[PDB]
Design a protein around this ligand. Structure first.
Ligand code: SB2
Length: 330
């Protein structure tokens, strides 16, 4: 049990342990706020996030539990990791605030390309996605602002609080699998290669039109898989557009990058390349190492189907804080 100290940070109040110093607001929001800090114990610069109204309601309580559970499970170089989780509370009764700690990251993919850089960045995203997907976890909202990158060009996936990077199947809500994330990677890789948003739709309808112009309208095989009567009708009522040749769209780009893009941006999710399969694509020949692209321990998401009371979620959250085991010093 450490010693905490208070201080007001941009309307937001903070009560962190002594080891953390020089809290400097990196931002704030409805979610709460994130402060840059110096970890006196390790000497490393960290990011400390205070959740706002963690247990204001059952949904909030559950979201709080969900985030903590996810963060505690992630142990991979290309995925945000939990350096520490703490609360000023001395017991469950007083338990009302949650602070999460991780290594400070300098910028995001938005803030920030040569082909070698695209290769290295996409390689790392895919390496992180292989790990996440092996634990039956789907990001569902991959985008540049969710990808942290430091000065070494090292990347970490995070989230897991916009439609420009969303797979078409999950933007209308048929069935979807882990590859919705692969689609997002495709949109991201395209943007890094061209410097422009691949599908900057004004809304979901416009978004879909933009996508179909590139990948072509659904073929007969894909149509046979659309259970939604209305969606099936709409799609079939549209202009029958031919699939463009990506080489003709991404002119001048590495032919291998073009090939990968064509394998990632496929409408039929059943045929979309997976993260593991993508890692072995020739485009990453310079970085791919089958012996160093680990999968994750099994992840128990059964809690997602549970309907509990606010007090019960708060309590489950409290236990997760208490049981937290710090990572080996780096
Ligand atoms: C919903 S809003 O757009 C929003 C923006 C940022 C964050 C946000 N949460 C974190 C953050 C901090 C510690 C953790 F353990 C986990 C996440 C960061 C962070 C991580 C590394 N370096 C600097 C800042 N940014 C949360 C919500």
């Amino acid at each position: 049990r450490p010693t905490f100290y208070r201080q007001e940070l941009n309307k937001t109040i903070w009560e962190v342990p002594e080891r953390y110093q020089n809290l400097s607001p990196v931002g704030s929001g409805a979610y709460g706020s994130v402060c840059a800090a110096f970890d006196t114990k390790t000497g490393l610069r960290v990011a400390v996030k205070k959740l706002s109204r963690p247990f204001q309601s059952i949904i909030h309580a559950k979201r709080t539990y969900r985030e903590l559970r996810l963060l505690k499970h992630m142990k991979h170089e290309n995925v945000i990791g939990l350096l520490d989780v703490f609360t000023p509370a001395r017991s469950l009764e007083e338990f009302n605030d949650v602070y999460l700690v991780t290594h400070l990251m300098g910028a995001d993919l938005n803030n920030i390309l040569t082909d070698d850089h695209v290769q290295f960045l996409i390689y790392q995203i895919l390496r992180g996605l292989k790990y996440i997907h092996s634990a039956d976890i789907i990001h569902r909202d991959l985008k540049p602002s969710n990808l942290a990158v430091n000065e070494d060009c090292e990347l970490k996936i995070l989230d897991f609080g916009t439609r420009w990077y969303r797979a078409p199947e999950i933007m209308l809500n048929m069935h979807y699998n882990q590859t919705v994330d692969i689609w997002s990677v495709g949109c991201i890789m395209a943007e890094l290669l061209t410097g422009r948003t691949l599908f900057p739709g004004t809304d979901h309808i416009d978004q879909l039109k933009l996508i179909l112009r590139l990948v072509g309208t659904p073929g007969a095989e894909l149509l046979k898989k659309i259970s939604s009567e209305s969606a099936r009708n709409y799609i079939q009522s549209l202009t029958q557009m031919p699939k463009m040749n990506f080489a003709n769209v991404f002119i001048g780009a590495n032919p291998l990058a073009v090939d990968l893009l064509e394998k990632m941006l496929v409408l039929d999710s059943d045929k979309r390349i997976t993260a593991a399969q993508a890692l072995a694509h020739a485009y990453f020949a310079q970085y791919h190492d089958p012996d160093d692209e680990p999968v994750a321990d099994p992840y128990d998401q059964s809690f997602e189907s549970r309907d509990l009371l606010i007090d019960e979620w708060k309590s489950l959250t409290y236990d997760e804080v208490i049981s937290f085991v710090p990572p080996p010093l780096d």
